[PDB]
Symmetry: C3
Subunit: 183 residues, 3 copies
């Protein structure tokens, strides 16, 4: 009941450009009013598997969205597949889909949905991770809370890079952040 996650195996669970082209490893642990989060990404096939910006100069970013309903349940338009996201049990998931995880959602007062009122940057956390664990291959991970439509809550990960990478496999080191919880 304290951790929502993807399991930490290498089985693809995520669709960026094509079905199951990636394994998003995400762990959300509820430390009361904050969620401690840990994330990494392995792209296993398709467009973002091997970066070559000589061949493809404008392939410089992509986005992974987790959309949740009023119950904190994952919506199927999410890039992360529903079968792969649940409370922890051992090194696996519970075999039954969870019904409520409002306690893990980003707080809507802290991180309001888009509206006509002033939009503040505090709903974003920036980090840098490294491709293949190499220190000279940074990519930015921008995490944004509750800015997607078609949901009550959202966490989006945008991965972008400014270097011209040539035949670099897109699999990442791990980043930790936190966010304020809905309840």
């Amino acid at each position: 009941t304290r951790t929502l996650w993807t399991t930490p195996d290498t089985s693809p669970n995520c669709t960026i450009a094509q079905d199951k082209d990636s394994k998003l490893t995400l762990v959300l642990t509820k430390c009361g009013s904050q969620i401690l989060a840990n994330v990494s990404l392995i792209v296993v096939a398709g467009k973002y598997h091997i970066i070559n910006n000589k061949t493809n100069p404008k392939i410089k970013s992509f986005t992974i969205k987790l959309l949740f309903n009023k119950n904190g349940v994952l919506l199927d338009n999410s890039n992360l597949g529903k079968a792969y996201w649940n409370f922890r049990s051992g090194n696996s998931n519970v075999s039954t889909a969870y019904e409520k995880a409002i306690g893990f959602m980003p707080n809507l007062v802290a991180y309001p949905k888009p509206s006509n009122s002033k939009k503040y940057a505090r709903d974003i956390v920036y980090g840098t991770i490294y491709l293949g664990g190499k220190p000279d291959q940074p990519a930015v991970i921008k995490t944004t809370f509750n800015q997607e439509t078609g949901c009550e809550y959202s966490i989006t990960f945008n991965f972008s890079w400014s270097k011209t990478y040539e035949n670099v496999e897109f699999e990442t080191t791990s980043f930790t952040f936190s966010y304020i919880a809905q309840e």
Copy 2:
């Protein structure tokens, strides 16, 4: 009833609660969550008025940093000469605070052995945490947030946030992305 003693915070609203250069010119959103012997901290800043609201280093090249101080007495109570106001610094209840001002929060204070006050002893850097946040959420607008534990005088404990930047920003509003860190608690 539903009072959260594991979290000291400013609330997550955008109501100004902080004085940098003039009364209530900013909202400091600061959440301290006690994970036992460590405090998990989440911080952002919105400046809404005065000198640090709109930065222009073409107009004012000297305006490059400012500091926000939280000073605490022996019981972990926020002193009135802090930049943050006492009115809405308290234990969490829902998205608001508990009804009455807290009297004890020693378990949220930074550890005085890890982070000693100034003295004759050698001063170590481990009482500082550096992070970079981004103005307006734009990746080409970094500013440095330097957090320092227990280096202020006239208090038992302190947490100070220094914000600075080295770029020459032109009409860049000072409102930041969020940054998470932790520190060792006093108990």
Copy 3:
């Protein structure tokens, strides 16, 4: 369960990088369920890595501090960190019994496998930057890797490196926070 495993927070050397007890690694691990919240800093007090001068010694650019653990999460004697004051917290010191089990504080083996024939993924690494002497123009990279050492069941390795040409700069750092997925 919600406990803290740490080095104590004094500045007494507890670590051997190049010579005996030449450093104080201050490391605090706090179990928040399936994740360990980690907080780390380093003070080198003596020896090869105390005062860096890359004008006279341009090739002195990195060093490594290893914590090796057995199947019960007990620190092994050949780790750079000494066993004497690595233990569960009591006040500003430690419990009086050296711990027997801390498997719940160990890096998860499925998330971070031990070296093998299989593909080594980068997710067993965390990168951060700390600053020498608290000076904003003195960065150094702290690279933390999980479960990549041999002769143990679990490991946490800190590699400290820098790319600036430091001239007589004392290696003592600001603090860095990270987390990792817990075995249990």
